[PDB]
Symmetry: D2
Subunit: 198 residues, 4 copies
């Protein structure tokens, strides 16, 4: 249906001291809400274009759709990938899947950390499942909608946009990327992997 702003499963300051409540608030109620509106409007402008049978602005409408919808999609998984009861390491299948796919959980951690801290502009680090080769792969996302193939199922995202850590970490993006591991909700990622493999 219409896109909507999801409700957080924890209080804004439940991730402190890893992630400030101040950022979580602005991030959620300001930033994320902006993409949900942008996604809904994009879908509405396209409805109109088809009705009036005028696609002179197709490029703009398609960019707005992809940008906002991807913005919305990314943030939705981001809030679920975070937990106050998080951290530690993944267990079972997922733990086994990550070890076979990246050699070790530490090697996986390293690659994810490097993809997240070397983005040139806004972006993300993403762990996803490739349906084609049936493999767990890490992708370096540019902005919200670029640098990955179609049909990839996202499992774990790390928001590398400046607004995700600036207020707190300032320019030191690697301290924020290291902190992230302390609030990862592996139960949600395990659930995602199980759904992707089935």
């Amino acid at each position: 249906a219409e896109y909507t702003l999801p409700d957080l499963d924890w209080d804004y300051g439940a991730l402190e001291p890893h992630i400030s409540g101040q950022i979580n608030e602005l991030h959620h109620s300001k930033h994320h809400a902006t993409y949900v509106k942008g996604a809904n409007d994009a879908v509405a402008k396209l409805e109109e274009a088809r009705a009036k049978e005028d696609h002179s602005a197709i490029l703009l409408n398609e960019k707005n759709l992809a940008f906002n919808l991807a913005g919305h999609v990314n943030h939705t998984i981001w809030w679920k990938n975070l937990s106050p009861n998080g951290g530690d390491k993944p267990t079972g299948e997922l733990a086994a899947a990550i070890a076979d796919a990246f050699g070790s959980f530490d090697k996986f951690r390293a690659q994810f950390h490097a993809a997240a801290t070397t983005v040139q502009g806004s972006g993300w680090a993403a762990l996803g499942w490739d349906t084609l080769g049936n493999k767990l792969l890490i992708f370096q996302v540019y902005d919200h909608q670029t640098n990955f193939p179609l049909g990839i199922v996202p499992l774990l995202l790390l928001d590398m946009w400046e607004h995700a850590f600036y207020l707190q970490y300032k320019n030191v993006k690697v301290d924020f990327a290291k902190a992230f591991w302390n609030v990862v909700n592996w139960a949600d990622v395990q659930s995602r992997y199980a759904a992707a493999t089935s």
Copy 2:
């Protein structure tokens, strides 16, 4: 396992005169095979990097992975989306789904056509299924890996890279985009749509 070049379901000149056998031979045996090799190589360079604990070239590795795997994925669906006993219009769920999401089939076709012919460089037009919103949406893909969100399930793709139409239609790509409709394998799209909703 390794990414592999899928075999075609028809002889090279099965789609004539809409699509030349000459283009299909080169397209398949040269272009597509090059992406498969690149995808496998990218995955191999990442294995090496993790083994050496050296991610100085993570940006390059991640770009080579996304570019080639996306090229491989895009072309694997392309070949299945085409059929000499194709053309017509979709039927069943797909027909109703398309009609109930774009107004009509013709309104869908007009938008797809507009997205396919206004790309500013290499790209594709794509019919995808959004899992968060549960909507059928059209996206305008730049290159192979850009301008769309994560989790989108591709249903129907239209390759708008110059090599896909140049030998036959030269600079008149809108003529190639029109001919495309005569060879679409709706049985394949219907099949992908059923799996995406199930």
Copy 3:
């Protein structure tokens, strides 16, 4: 010689309250300095590649060079486009050129503002001289190095990367885009325009 981090022609807090001294400090000593080190590194990397006759990482070296040199080029102009004893309005040559190119300073200001506040990720708003058509145009720059032609002479830049106003304005980027006009150094732009027309 190597690229260098230029000195500010004013104290870090000279722009308050329009732009905080804390942002100016970080911006200058941390961000800008990073691009200078990155362009020098890219340049050296290419020297070594040429000496070793090995261009296996040509894509990465060209990307690192473009991104960091453009980051360095944009910030260098940005520092010079600001002044504590500036803002308000341009005169003589450019004042006439701007009204002729955009109808009025106010119409010019509105499009500049619109270009600055609608970027989809990190970017800039830029006023440049097109040598080919001998026209004054405004460009919407993506990141540091994208969305503009070769040969464009930059005259006035507005940094829209989140790190440019986040600490102070938070998510309200239009309030920062508006406060920018109070510190523009018209003399510097006026000077860049005569040289471009020369």
Copy 4:
């Protein structure tokens, strides 16, 4: 005034057999012409936008402006960089400048070639003059307006868009990149170089 399609300084088939007369007519008369009209169209919509005080499509107008203006700029220099009486090596200042900046003319050829043949989608190889560092550098241009800094003076360009060699070289882009050195108009590049360092 308006942007115009420049006339070629030679007959369409004057570059044979290095570059077909067929590709030259299509390239010039069809492709280049579209970029000229697209740039003039973009400039007009922006005039209209300013008149109606409506910048709701500013992202689209700025992208169409950049893409087409860049398309037009790149091809104008392309026609001038080619010559039937071309080839050989650069002499005088330029020769010494290249050797000084790249080690040798052959080390320059190798880098330029690699940059040209590794583009992931549409792009160009370009030799430019960096006004800031006063350095001669090679950039790997994506599409027509991406992957290079502002203020860069283009000297020599190599069109790597598929429509530039497909009809004749098919998928073998490296054979076309090699053939290129046979029609390079060093008299033009030397002239551009003198103007840039002036």
